[PDB]
């Protein structure tokens, strides 16, 4: 879909409140980084509600956009419209095994979304557009002034702090 | 051939009014299986349980909901038939006697007697009423002639001219005036006609560049020898 959010429901993130790092699964699609969204904390339906908090994305750091960036196979094209089978479109979560030859062919209709061609973006051999990782995997050099001696250093979210002689 | 719809009569609005069964609804978009949408005319037997599920997709059109109309238990909207299957009465004026009648696409043509008066009448089939009625400029007795049973109003067929006959067997020389009335009789100096033939004939024997049109009325006159 062309109208992709910044992060999708299901992305795993952590928030550091009260010094407790809390790990939670994003419950809704994020459209702007200055908003606040609900996260279900993860290690007859009250237990499902008991572990949601709403947090702002400043506080939250996404580890993974695990899922829910939707890629489907175009099963038909017609005029301005298209039929596309995406993973997870079936409201019947209990139909995870109808991949047999006896799959009621109405189920394949139930599985596919009907959209307009202009609402879709073609996925090329490079995969879906990756959200850039927020972990600086490799060491990055800092611009140390010349002819200076470093007496002490430390770190914080604010950046690097150092005493220079 | 390219035909002007004015001259065409549709016999039966046969087929090609496609009813589809809605197979899936997705917000404002829908998938509908309509008959004859499979470009593979050779898939007429894939109605088995092993029917490749992709074939069902190939068979159904994708549209928006606003482009569709629900078919109710009365079927598709019938185009009204152009053939008046049952007899329809015409609005005949009271106290009139009918001397002759004939037909054409223009409607019904009849000669009506009213006491000592004689009138020529054209009837509209939509309303059933006379579209125009005119008294003859000649004496009514002269039209009634020696034998009123001889009165007639012959036509060549469709799109035809009209030939009246009086009670003497004479062709009555009709013509409209510029007021919509009847001009003085432009006499023909003709003997009586015992019988007259009727029909329309093609003139395709003509060259395509002819000024004479590709149609004509053919009239055969059994003229009496005086």
Distance (Å) from the alpha carbon of A69 to chain B's nearest alpha carbon = 20
Distance (Å) from the alpha carbon of A89 to chain B's nearest alpha carbon = 11
- Cβ of B29 within 8 Å of Cβ of A115? The answer is yes
CA distance A78 to B78: 29
- Which tokens sit at B207? 């060259």
CA distance A10 to A68: 7
Among residues B37, B25, B53, which one has the least CA distance to residue A108? B53
Chain CA centroid to CA B32, Å: 39
Sole residue written with tokens 């770190």? A155
Residues 6+ apart with CB under 8 A from A88: A68, A70
- Cβ of B58 within 8 Å of Cβ of A76? The answer is yes
Sole residue written with tokens 């599985």? A111
- Contact between B128 and B89 (Cβ < 8 Å): yes
- Contact between A142 and B52 (Cβ < 8 Å): no
- Cβ of B29 within 8 Å of Cβ of A112? The answer is no
- Cβ of B26 within 8 Å of Cβ of A110? The answer is no
Sole residue written with tokens 């329809």? B88
CA distance B205 to B38: 47
Query: Residues of A with CB below 8 A from B37's CB?
Result: none
CA distance A53 to B47: 53
- Contact between B145 and B205 (Cβ < 8 Å): no
Write out the H or E segment, with its range, that includes residue B112: strand B107-114
- Contact between A29 and A9 (Cβ < 8 Å): yes
For B31, the closest chain A residue by CA position comes to A114
What per-residue string of b and e applies to B66-90 under the rule 16 or more CB within 10 Å gives b? Answer: eeeeeeeeeeeeeeeeeeeeeeeeb
Count Cβ atoms within 10 A of the Cβ of residue B220 and give its class: 0-12 exposed, 13-18 middle, 19 or more buried: exposed
- Cβ of B58 within 8 Å of Cβ of A103? The answer is no
Among residues B174, B221, B220, which one has the least CA distance to residue B194? B221
Distance (Å) from the alpha carbon of A72 to chain B's nearest alpha carbon = 15
Q: How far is CA A67 from CA A106, A130, B164, B192, in A?
A: 27, 12, 91, 102
CA distance A83 to B58: 11
- Cβ of A108 within 8 Å of Cβ of B49? The answer is no
Query: Residues of A with CB below 8 A from B47's CB?
Result: none
CA distance B219 to B156: 7
Q: How far is CA B202 from CA B158, B208, B213, B218, in A?
A: 13, 13, 9, 9
Query: Residues of A with CB below 8 A from B58's CB?
Result: 76
Write out the H or E segment, with its range, that includes residue B111: strand B107-114
- Which tokens sit at B133? 């009625």
- Which tokens sit at B93? 């004026």
- Cβ of B50 within 8 Å of Cβ of A114? The answer is no
Cβ–Cβ pairs < 8 A, chains A and B: 54
Write out the E strands in chain A.
12-17, 20-26, 36-41, 52-56, 60-64, 73-78, 81-85, 112-116, 150-156, 159-164
- For chain A, list residues whose CB is within 8 angstroms of any CB belonging to chain B: 75-76, 78-79, 81-83, 101-103, 105-110, 112-116
CA distance A62 to A10: 11
Distance (Å) from the alpha carbon of A21 to chain B's nearest alpha carbon = 41
Looking at chain B, the number of H-run helices and the number of E-run strands are: 2, 14
- Cβ of B26 within 8 Å of Cβ of A76? The answer is no
Write out the H or E segment, with its range, that includes residue A107: helix A105-111
Q: DSSP letter string over B47-91?
A: -STT--HHHHHHHEEEEEGGG--PPPTT-S-PPPPSS--S-----
Q: Which of A107, A110, A114 sits opposite B29 (nearest CB)?
A: A114
**Chosen from A1, A78, A86 to mutate, greatest number of chain B CBs within 10 A:** A78
Residues 6+ apart with CB under 8 A from B218: B156, B197, B199, B200, B201
Q: What is the resolution of this structure in A?
A: 3.9
B49 touches chain A (CB under 8 A): yes
């Amino acid at each position: 879909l062309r109208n992709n959010p910044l992060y999708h429901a299901g992305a795993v993130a952590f928030s550091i409140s009260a010094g407790i790092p809390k790990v939670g699964v994003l419950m809704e699609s994020v459209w702007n980084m200055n908003d606040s969204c609900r996260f279900q904390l993860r290690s007859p339906k009250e237990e499902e509600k008991v572990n949601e908090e709403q947090w702002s994305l400043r506080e939250v750091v996404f580890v993974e956009d695990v899922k829910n960036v939707p890629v489907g196979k175009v099963l038909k094209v017609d005029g301005a419209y298209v039929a596309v089978k995406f993973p997870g479109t079936s409201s019947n979560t209990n139909c995870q095994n109808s991949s047999g030859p006896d799959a009621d062919p109405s189920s394949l209709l139930q599985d596919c979304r009907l959209l307009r061609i202009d609402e879709l973006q073609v996925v090329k051999t490079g995969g879906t557009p990756k959200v850039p990782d927020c972990f600086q995997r490799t060491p990055k050099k800092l611009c140390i002034p010349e002819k200076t001696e470093i007496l002490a250093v430390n770190v914080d979210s604010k950046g690097v702090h150092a005493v220079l002689k | 051939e390219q035909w002007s719809l004015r001259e065409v009569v549709f016999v039966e609005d046969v087929k090609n009014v496609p009813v589809g069964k809605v197979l899936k609804v997705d917000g404002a978009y829908v998938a509908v299986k309509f008959p004859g949408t499979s470009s593979n005319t050779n898939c007429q037997n894939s109605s088995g349980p092993d029917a490749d599920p992709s074939s069902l997709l190939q068979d159904c059109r994708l549209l928006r909901i606003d482009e569709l109309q629900v078919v109710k238990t009365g079927g598709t909207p019938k185009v009204p038939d152009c053939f008046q299957r049952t007899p329809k009465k015409l609005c005949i004026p009271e106290k009139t006697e009918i001397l002759a009648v004939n037909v054409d696409s223009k409607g019904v043509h009849a000669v009506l007697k009213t006491g000592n008066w004689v009138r020529y009448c054209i009837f509209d089939l939509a309303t059933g009423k006379a579209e125009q009625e005119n008294n003859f400029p000649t004496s009514s007795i002269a039209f009634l002639g020696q034998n009123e049973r001889n009165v007639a109003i012959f036509t060549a067929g469709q799109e035809s001219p009209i030939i009246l006959r009086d009670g003497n067997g004479t062709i009555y020389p009709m013509a409209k005036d510029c007021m919509g009335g009847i001009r003085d009789p432009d006499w023909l100096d003709l003997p009586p006609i015992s019988s007259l033939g009727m029909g329309v004939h093609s003139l395709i024997n003509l060259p395509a560049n002819s000024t004479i049109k590709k149609k004509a009325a053919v009239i055969i006159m059994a003229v009496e020898k005086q």
